[PDB]
Structures are given as structure tokens and as C-alpha cells.
């Protein structure tokens with residue numbers, strides 16, 4: 001166990017899970033919270049919405065404001081740049097793991 | 102493709118490479134710099150010694166001053182905790198990459 005790594009790793013894991021999920025389908029932030037927990041990653045809003053906003057700014061997520069069932073909500077989906085990023089990032093993890101035996 | 106990730110990733114990669122090398126054998130700072138370069142991670146002393154010092158503080162590296170061949174030098178080697186950390190960390194990277202395929 002190594003806490004500096006695990007603390008940084010947490011940020012990577014969240015980030016890549018968002019892109020992965022937002023690639024598969026359109027996602028609400030509320031659901032992302034629960035989905036991430038289900039995968040073993042503790043994220044409370046205050047990290048999530050920020051990183052979501054950052055992800056859009058970086059042009060890897062695109063968002064829609066949308067009124068559905070009398071409810072105003074924002075949905076996110078992965079841009080093609082986001083899809084690229086996910087694969088590049090996944091590969092980088094693979095190369096590192098193999099590099100160190 | 103994703104420079105925010107790659108910026109953080111670089112720090113992780115360096116950290117793990119040190120542990121990997123310092124696990125296999127005792128290492129001088131100068132040699133770490135060359136080995137890291139060879140692996141495509143440009144690290145200058147202003148970065149390295151801090152990382153090394155932090156790694157020691159986290160109890161994953163141990164350093165020794167010793168006089169060898171009339172030349173006084175400091176060596177670093179991975180503690181058993183460092184060896185553990187490397188494995189746990191490597192595995193964590195593997196599980197992430199696989200679970201976002």
C-alpha cells in the first residue's frame with residue numbers, strides 16, 4: 001500500500017471511468033456518482049461536477065441542457081476527442097504496468 | 102491527446118520507475134537519471150532528489166551514505182514496503198486499464 005500513488009490513481013480512475021461511461025451513453029452527474037461507487041471509487045460532488053466541467057472545457061465531454069419529464073438537467077457524452085483520449089490514456093497505463101515488470 | 106492526464110501520468114511513471122529500479126538493486130541518483138531518460142522520461146536533479154526524498158519519507162526508499170573506492174556517495178534501494186507498493190501499484194494500473202477497455 002502506497003497513499004501518494006493511490007491518491008493520484010483515484011483521480012485518474014474517476015477521469016477515465018467518466019470518459020468510458022460517457023462514451024457508451026449520455027450520462028447525468030447524479031448517476032455517475034452511483035456508477036463510480038459501484039466500481040469501487042468514492043467520489044462526492046465537489047470533485048465530480050468540477051472534473052465534468054473541466055472535461056468539457058478540455059473538449060473531451062460535450063454537455064446538453066435538457067428538459068425531460070418536467071426536469072431541467074445536464075447530460076454529458078464523450079466527444080471524438082474524448083474517445084481518443086480514453087484509448088491513449090488506457091494504452092499509457094498498459095505500457096507503464098508492463099514497463100515495471 | 103489528453104495533456105492534463107499526461108502531465109500527472111508523468112509524475113506517477115517516474116515514481117514507479119524509481120521503485121522498480123531501486124527494487125532490483127542499489128542506485129545512485131546519476132544512474133537513475135540515465136535509466137529514466139532511456140525509458141523516455143526526462144528528469145532533471147531539481148525534480149529527482151525531491152521525489153527520492155519524498156519516497157524515503159513515505160518509507161518506500163532508504164538511502165545510505167558510503168565511501169567506496171575513495172569516493173563518498175549516497176545510494177538508494179527500495180524497502181520491502183517499496184517492493185510491496187510497486188506490485189500493488191502495478192496491479193492497480195492493470196485493473197484500471199482492463200476495466201475501461
Ligand SMILES: [Mn+2]
Pocket residue numbers: 035
Ligand atoms: Mn459501469
Ligand SMILES: [Mn+2]
Pocket residue numbers: 136
Ligand atoms: Mn532499465
